[PDB]
Design a protein around this ligand. Structure first.
Ligand code: CL
Ligand code: CL
Ligand code: CL
Ligand code: CL
Lengths: 225, 225
């Protein structure tokens, strides 16, 4: 039953449909239509942020959703579903996969990651949980403390992985981790997405290169000077 | 004054923000936000279809707009601002540039293109008019009958130009036309947009590669099989 969720994304594309408050297309309505567009193009899952976006996305597609809640506390640089409070809001709405910052950095509620995951696995025993990590060490650790999925989402986004390449850290993760590794973070060309599967990713997440038109526009503009 | 409009786009990127009725993001609201995103990414103009989209786009950006009205009559394959009726609706709303199918094909109102343009140039003598053409012959003809701009928009979209390449027909148009030639139609990579300027285009229009996420998604999906 949690197996059926992972077979439905095996070897397929997941499109991240996010637009925070600063961003041009910030609107639950638009993110719902972006999800529909990814579906019409052949995507097999959606990654989505906040409950209002997730709800609207559910009206447009019946694709599986990786759900997160980004909230920035002033204690911590851990902000992807960082505390127990975000987990419950997502459990209440219902998503196929809840993704959580699984780096070694200190959390806003100053709770160990080993306990935190033990508490939600005890509390929500049928819920698929995904680990957003930045290094191979953290990906193996996430595996042993009980995560169902890892993702290379935070590669290059921590001090201790500054300038790490997505694909380069992926082939290190994939060769030592046994649970599904989802390639995610700066997979911004179709060719990189092919290489990610050829490296051994279980699925590939693409965000801005599909759903942030201002960042696609800036690529065109900067090569026209 | 019409000169200031063309200097503001010289050597720059125009982003076409369109989504017809069949399409995932069909909504004037979304097309307004897409225009804002192109602006945030560094675009210098917007191409837009229908008055409700143009109006919403005007709320988001003060970039110059190439305005069209696509309407398909059962008489003709000419559908980009095809009759005098669409021209007036756009004149009433007010756009910096009105773009019109300027191919040699028979129009829905069975009026010659030479007269049609003479009537609107007489009627709207300060309005900048752009010629959407498919071949070099039609681009030179558009120039002599009084158009202000030509665009390679319909290259490959007429029986007599089946399989013509955008860039290949562009360098033929640019070497014999004196008025500004805008490269438009299947300019779907940043590199093609650089080559279009290097060929001699006055400006470059990019559409789906920025503003149709389902067609960007399909490029990723098809290279993941
Ligand atoms: Cl994310
Ligand atoms: Cl991130
Ligand atoms: Cl068009
Ligand atoms: Cl077209």
């Amino acid at each position: 039953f949690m197996n059926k969720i992972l077979e439905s994304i095996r070897g397929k594309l997941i499109v991240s449909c996010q637009a925070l408050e600063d961003e041009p297309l910030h609107s639950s309505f638009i993110m719902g239509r972006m999800a529909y567009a990814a579906y019409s193009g052949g995507a097999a899952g959606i990654r989505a942020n906040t409950v209002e976006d997730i709800k609207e996305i559910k009206k447009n597609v019946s694709l599986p959703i990786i759900g997160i809640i980004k909230k920035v506390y002033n204690n911590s640089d851990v902000y992807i579903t960082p505390t127990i409070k975000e987990v419950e809001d997502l459990i209440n709405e219902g998503v196929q996969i809840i993704a959580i910052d699984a780096t070694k950095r200190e959390r806003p509620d100053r709770k160990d990651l080993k306990n935190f995951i033990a508490e939600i696995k005890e509390k929500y025993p049928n819920q698929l949980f995904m680990a957003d990590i930045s290094s191979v060490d953290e990906a193996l650790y996430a595996e042993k403390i009980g995560f169902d999925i890892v993702g290379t989402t935070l590669v290059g986004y921590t001090d201790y992985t500054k300038n790490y390449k997505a694909l380069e850290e992926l082939k290190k993760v994939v060769k030592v981790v046994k649970i599904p590794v989802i390639a995610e973070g700066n997979i911004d060309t179709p060719l990189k997405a092919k290489k990610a599967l050829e490296i051994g990713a279980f699925a590939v997440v693409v965000g801005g290169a599909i759903t942030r038109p201002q960042q696609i526009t800036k690529k065109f503009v900067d090569e026209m000077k």
